[PDB]
Amino acid sequence: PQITLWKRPIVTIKIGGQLREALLDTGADDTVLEDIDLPGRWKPKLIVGIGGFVKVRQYEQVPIEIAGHKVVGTVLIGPTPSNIIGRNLMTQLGATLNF
């Protein structure tokens, strides 16, 4: 799909059998989700945003569906005001910005 930016670019995701919404975020290198259970091992990671840092769990090779597209990639789980899909997963969709 093509979307304009008058509204927040929010898409449906399915991850670990959980349905959520998340923002397609070209300003995010990595994908950060708050509200999710993932199985198995993870690595501590500190990430830096506007207004400081948060501690997240890095989960690797997580299967995730973004607006119908199945991809596998790194997901960070931790406090974020908004679930965000980063460039790590949007590149797997072949996503582009046009102006």
Ligand X SMILES: CC(C)CN(C[C@@H](O)[C@H](Cc1cc(F)cc(F)c1)NC(=O)O[C@H]1[C@H]2CO[C@H]3OC[C@@H]1[C@H]3C2)S(=O)(=O)c1ccc2nc(NC3CC3)sc2c1
Residues with catalytic roles:
25
89 binds ligand X (CB under 6 A): no
47 binds ligand X (CB under 6 A): yes
Q: Are 39 and 48 in contact (CB under 8 A)?
A: no
φ, ψ dihedrals at 35, nearest 5°: -90, 40
Binding site for a second copy (CB under 8 A): 1-6, 8-9, 23-29, 32, 47-54, 67, 69, 79-82, 84, 87, 90-91, 93-99
* All residues at 6 or more sequence positions from 82 whose CB lies less than 8 Å from its CB, including other chains: 22, 23
Q: Which is nearer to a second copy, 17 or 53 (CB)?
A: 53
